[PDB]
Amino acid sequence: ASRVVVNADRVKGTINRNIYGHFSEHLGRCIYEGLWVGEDSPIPNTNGIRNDVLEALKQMKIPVLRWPGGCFADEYHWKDGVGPREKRKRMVNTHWGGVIENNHFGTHEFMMLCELLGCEPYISGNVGSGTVQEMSEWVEYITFDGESPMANWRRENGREKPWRIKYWGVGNQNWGCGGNMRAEYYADLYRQFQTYLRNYGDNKLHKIACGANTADYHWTEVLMKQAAPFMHGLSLHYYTVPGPWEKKGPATGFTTDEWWVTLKKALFMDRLVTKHSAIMDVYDPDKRIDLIVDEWGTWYDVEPGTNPGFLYQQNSIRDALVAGATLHIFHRHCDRVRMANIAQLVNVLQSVILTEGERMLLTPTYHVFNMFKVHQDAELLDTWESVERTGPEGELPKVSVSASRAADGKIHISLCNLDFETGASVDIELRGLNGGVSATGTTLTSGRIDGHNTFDEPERVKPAPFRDFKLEGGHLNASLPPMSVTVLELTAG
Ligand SMILES: OC[C@@H]1O[C@@H](O[C@@H]2[C@@H](O)[C@H](O[C@@H]3CO[C@@H](O)[C@H](O)[C@H]3O)OC[C@H]2O[C@@H]2OC[C@@H](O)[C@H](O)[C@H]2O)[C@H](O)[C@H]1O
User: Fold this and answer.
1) Which in 150, 343, 450, 451 has the greatest CB count within 10 A?
2) Which Gene3D superfamilies match (predicted)?
3) Best mutation site among 67, 95, 346, 349 for ligand 1, i.e. most ligand atoms within 8 A of its Cβ?
4) Helix, strand, coil: what percent of the chain each, to 5?
């Protein structure tokens, strides 16, 4: 059995709710159809945004949403997306299908979406092909409460008082699609651009510099050495890609080897965060600067017969395990990691939701985010563990476990069983509790390693009650189902 000791009276820090963040690019059907259907759509909607998706995302408690992209954000000229909707310019979505963007979803529609969702906006500005004045004017347009060409324009377009926004990304993937820049050059641009992004009124911008791709430690070193005093956060991008880029593998119908490889690569997040954080510690020992993992998740070959530029992929219990295990990694590093954004909210990459016209389904990934929402802004509890191994040559931990205490005093313990073949015995010792407790549980599992939901069968994989445990005086013994994500709730009394 795996052994876990939860020290309920020992708080290790706060799990920022933004660790549970999301990301929606103008790519494929993430924005159009996935969210924006238009006010005159036969699809039931609120001001042009489909209701089924809205309600599901509200239930999930989305904390923050990144927009309008990765790559698209460094091609975007925000002025194209404001003004009378019917008069907005077209565009060439160069990176993603080479299709035409109608700009009907723009700044006002995105702010409205965030308000409808109850989430924070995180906007990514254009460095690669934009100018300093253009980005500065966007911030002014959004946040300025006085009179000026930009503020007046905002009011004309129907938003009288300024919006508040905290998170502002000063360019995306500038080492690549954002201009193929050396770190030294981007650091100079970053320092210049950020100078002109002001705090107007009561707004306080948290300026985020473009961070490393995967294991590019040199990028982190340069950006920290050259630009630390001018940033409030530094990003990191890491996708879980089973096979070579040229042939990543399928989202469903994959082999056992692909199961193990996928989970092994997902867990590499821990090494990356650890090593990037170590460099950040050298230049920023007080940990003032956030590490922001603003693109992560699995990336497979798209579904057969679909446009590879649209990145539509299915989503299975394998993805749920990647999501659960990775979120636990963020928990462990919550002293430095204060936001993460899983790549792509709807119809794109590792989505929580997929739509097909008026129909939608919730993926196993959605269910993980919904079950784990109890960790948002929770206090991380000290836990010691000794877990059995699983997979080829015991390369994987059998179980991943995290415990937190919510503001209402309830304790949540979440556990992932990475082995698809057998259940996992976990003995959890509860210490420093004070009173006594009772427990309920919920578990997300499947009977197939590629178990997934479809439009005809939207509920093939979904949470269910979990009762296979015993709680007896300071000890909670659980038998986790194979390939499962489980959440236990302990209440006083
Ligand atoms: O979310 C979609 C898209 O993803 C981001 O750009 C991705 C990269 O992050 C990806 O990085 C690779 C990760 O694995 C590493 O080993 C490797 O060295 C990295 O290069 O590479 C591809 C890129 O997607 C391309 O975006 C441009 C488009 O024209 C291509 O078709 C895509 O494949 C973006 O930030 C975000 O838009």
Assistant:
1) 343
2) Glycosidases (3.20.20.80), Golgi alpha-mannosidase II (2.60.40.1180)
3) 95
4) 30, 30, 40
Contact at 8 Å (CB) between 237 and 169? Answer: no
- Taking the CA atoms of 489, 322, 478 and 9 in sequence, report the sign of the dihedral they define: negative
Question: Do residues 430 and 439 make contact, with C-beta atoms less than 8 angstroms apart?
Answer: no
- String of DSSP letters for 84-137: -GGG----EETTTTTEE----S-HHHHHHHHHHHT-EEEEEE--SS--HHHHHH
71 Cα: distance to centroid of ligand 1 (angstroms): 8
Instruction: Give me ligand 1 centre to Cα 237, in Å.
Output: 9
Closest to 49 in 3D by CA, of 108, 134, 90: 108
Under 8 Å between Cβ of 439 and 412: no
Q: How far is the CA of 238 from the centre of ligand 1 (A)?
A: 9
Please, which experimental method was used?
Answer: X-ray
CB atoms within 10 A of CB 430: 22
Region(s) of the chain under CATH 3.20.20.80: 16-376
Q: Report which ligand 1 atom has the smallest distance to the Cα of 239.
A: 13
* SS3 state of residue 60: helix
Architecture of the domain made up of 1-15+377-493: Sandwich (2.60)
* C-beta contacts of 388-394 below 8 A and 24+ residues apart: 388/1, 388/2, 388/424, 390/418, 390/419, 391/260, 391/263, 391/264, 391/418, 391/419, 392/260
- Pairing relation of β-strands 389-390 and 396-397? antiparallel
Peptide bond into 250 cis (omega under 30): no
Contact 322, 29 (CB under 8 A): no
- Kindly state the tokens that stand for 197: 């992004």
- Best of 173, 268, 269 to mutate for ligand 1, by most ligand atoms within 8 A of CB? 173
Residue 25, CA distances (Å) to 60, 111, 362, 484 in order: 19, 15, 19, 30
User: Is there a contact between 324 and 442 (Cβ–Cβ < 8 Å)?
Assistant: no
Residue nearest to ligand 1 atom 30, measured at CA: 95
Pocket residues: Cβ below 6 A from ligand 1: 25, 69-71, 95, 172-173, 177, 213-214, 237, 239, 241, 295, 343-344, 349
Residue nearest to atom 36 of ligand 1 (CA): 70
Ligand 1 atom 5 nearest Cα: 70
CB 7 within 8 A of CB 380: no
CATH number of 16-376: 3.20.20.80
173 CA distance to ligand 1 middle (Å): 8
